[PDB]
Symmetry: C3
Subunit: 216 residues, 3 copies
């Protein structure tokens, strides 16, 4: 009851995030960890209890911290507001084999999975998720609530705006110091996409080369 | 003499697997290792004897273990029954930098090369080969004799059936808990393919988006 | 005094390479390192001096050594010729997590970034550059001034001749011991390309499957 740690999201990447958090805090006992999930509430998962947000907040504990495993960026932002209302701490999570080089600034709530790499001179906003094998290269600027799926490749001089999603195995061409390649606010780079130029806000791009997807 | 280790396949991935098996068993002396290859039999490779299978089986050793470094799924299954006939052990081989998270069940004869990753809640059958940079994500089920080429990306809630082959740099969309994405028995996902829906048994798909070849 | 190390190239991969070379030679103090860049001569970068080539060469120091961060292989070759005139020593730089297996022969001036992998029975020429997540598999022969962009995947039995550039996220199909797949001298494999057959010297390919795009 000195500290309880929650992984918000029992389904999906939550099961991947839990062991990473266990490794971040190896001296905490298993009983100090829980999944938070309104829906899978009441159950157990991989030996951990699954709590509703109310049961989690109501637990007796001097300090509480949470990592939000939820991929959807809008939901992530919503859960964050909730956590802050209740004064819960945002946990930063990284993997043992993550590589980070020079002058990398990272906002709170980061989550960096195995085999991730951030090189040099990079600014990343809040609640950035980088799934396995994804990377950010030199002179990039990443906004808030950005999500990289596994194997997402963000090369040099790219600016990615808030709420963007870079899909599995996608690759993004480097920009230049004078002309960064921009991934627009809320833009979605679909899996396997090969992005050769800036992506407008709010569109989905797919294919090689990447093109705007007609969705209806 | 107490233990001899064989790497089945001297051409191809065999040369990559031997250093992995050497590191996996550091206290064994060089002389306890060999390639097994009918054909290159009698020769030498990176300082190791290359023996015929018969020659290998006949060596005086209390215990014998083999890793099959052959990517071809059908040959692999053939060599397995051969080994079992002679009571040779199936060696499991991982790389020093391989990552495995929670609740991963793996059948005998697995081979996980450098930079491989298995996440959480995964069931993998027998004689699974994952080459460099390949991964399996959450809640997947992988059958027997499945093979991942380098960089193959298997995302969450995917079921990959026996003898499937996932080509280099290929990427598979995640399923969901109610509807897994399924890679059918003996299906071939071609290199660089971008798979967005289930692949029927015995079929080859290629391209982005992946389409039947 | 005694030894100074230059990183040739302040822009592009320079800021990535500097911390790698720092780690390669951890007993050398920061003051013994500089970026070499005529354009940015006189400035400072990530707390390091940026020197013109002439000023670097003019330093009082028994021994001078350089790693060329520049990916552009044509420029890289001219720079080497420049460095040889002044008898500057060429450094080899790897990353801590780089993996190299059996019988890998590598010429001087190699640069292997984080998460790179060289397997077995490989011959690599001079001034090879492998950026993050790139690899070379078994039985490959790689010439001089070859550049692998990040995530470049060179499978088995491939011969990549002088000055070839393998683009970010590109994949090259394995050849056979009898029929190696050949990437011709000075060819350019475009980002994201899926190369299924030999590429002629001096041309560019792109796409899935890769097709010749620029041949004149």
């Amino acid at each position: 009851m000195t500290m309880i740690i929650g992984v918000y999201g029992a389904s999906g990447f939550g099961k991947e995030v839990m062991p990473l958090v266990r490794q971040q805090f190896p001296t905490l006992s298993k009983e100090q960890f829980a999944f938070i999930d309104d829906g899978l509430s009441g159950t157990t998962l991989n030996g951990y209890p699954v709590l509703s947000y109310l049961d989690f907040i109501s637990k007796p504990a001097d300090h509480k911290a949470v990592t939000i495993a939820i991929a959807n960026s809008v939901v992530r932002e919503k859960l964050v507001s909730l956590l802050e209302k209740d004064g819960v701490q945002h946990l930063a999570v990284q993997s043992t084999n993550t590589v980070i080089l020079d002058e990398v600034e990272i906002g709170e709530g980061s989550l960096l999975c195995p085999f991730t790499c951030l090189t040099s001179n990079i600014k990343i906003g809040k609640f950035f998720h980088a799934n396995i094998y994804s990377y950010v290269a030199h002179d990039c600027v990443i906004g808030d609530y950005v999500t990289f799926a596994p194997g997402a490749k963000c090369n040099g001089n790219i600016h990615i705006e808030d709420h963007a999603y870079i899909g599995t195995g996608a690759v993004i061409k480097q920009g230049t110091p004078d002309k960064p390649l921009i991934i627009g606010k809320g833009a979605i780079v679909g899996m396997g996409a090969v992005v050769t130029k800036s992506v407008p806000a709010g569109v989905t791009v797919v294919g090689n080369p990447a093109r705007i997807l007609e969705r209806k």
